[PDB]
Design a protein around this ligand. Structure first.
Ligand SMILES: CN1N=C(C(=O)O)[C@@H]2[C@@H](C(=O)O)NC[C@@H]21
Ligand SMILES: [Cl-]
Length: 262
């Protein structure tokens, strides 16, 4: 049939998608800025479609409720037909791959440790061998699942602690995790994706630090409904954009050009 505007679902997560300061005076796609806003424009240009950015209605990434079997978040919007494509820091995972299609990754990352500056922790092993400093993950996401599945002694010790810790060590959003690090006087460490950690480290108040290496290696992908015809072109566009340097240009624009910490 005739071409229609492609509905893009995305999520407010810095520096991927943010409201422009003057969004009250703006309409449509111009309300938003960030890495994924720029990426959406490039994908649409390289696939020849017009598009409308929308913020996921429930504010969530995408997980399946164990009792109802209903998918929430951006994944749900694709699964149930409410959006045509998701362009966001959505981690490529086994369970999501079963219900949606993912492009090859547009960004590489791994699980990492965030501390308040001066916290006496250098590694995951350090965290696992002590109790004074609490530590946790985003409550629904791929980081939590890495710990749930690990056979590595240190990480399994960490999961056994986190899953039963009181009060809960799990947080609702990145912003909550960061705030908890900043306000807990060194007594909370946050396990999160290296991409967010590295962004936050270069934002005022310049009071956090990434410690140690990454624990794994994964990727973010552009997602489409399973079997969608848009999937093939989007996948080729991601590879083409990487090969020409555009993805790294956008990463440097949104991470290090805008660093506030010297
Ligand atoms: C904010 N992000 N942190 C995550 C984590 O699990 O650390 C989630 C992960 C996912 O797609 O589940 N990538 C987006 C979310
Ligand atoms: Cl081991």
């Amino acid at each position: 049939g005739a071409n229609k505007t492609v509905v893009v679902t995305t999520i407010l997560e810095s520096p991927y998608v943010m409201m422009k300061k003057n969004h009250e005076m703006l309409e449509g796609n111009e309300r938003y800025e960030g890495y994924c806003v720029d990426l959406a424009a490039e994908i649409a240009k390289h696939c020849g479609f017009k598009y409308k950015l929308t913020i996921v209605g429930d504010g969530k990434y995408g997980a399946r409720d164990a009792d109802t079997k209903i998918w929430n978040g951006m994944v749900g919007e694709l699964v149930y037909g409410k959006a045509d494509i998701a362009i966001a820091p959505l981690t490529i995972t086994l369970v999501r791959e079963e219900v949606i299609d993912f492009s090859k990754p547009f960004m590489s990352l791994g699980i990492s440790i965030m501390i308040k500056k001066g916290t006496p922790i250098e590694s995951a092993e350090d965290l696992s061998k002590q109790t004074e400093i609490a530590y946790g993950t985003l409550d629904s996401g791929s980081t939590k699942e890495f710990f749930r599945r690990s056979k590595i002694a240190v990480f399994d010790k960490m999961w056994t602690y986190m899953r039963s810790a009181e009060p809960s060590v799990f947080v609702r959003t990145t912003a909550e995790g960061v705030a908890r690090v900043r306000k807990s006087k060194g007594k909370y460490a946050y396990l999160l994706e290296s991409t967010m950690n590295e962004y936050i480290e270069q934002r005022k108040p310049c009071d956090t630090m990434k410690v140690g290496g990454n624990l794994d290696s994964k990727g973010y992908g552009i997602a489409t409904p399973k079997g969608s015809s848009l999937g093939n072109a989007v996948n080729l566009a991601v590879l083409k954009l990487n090969e020409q340097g555009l993805l790294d240009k956008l990463k440097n624009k949104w991470w290090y050009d805008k660093g506030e910490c010297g």
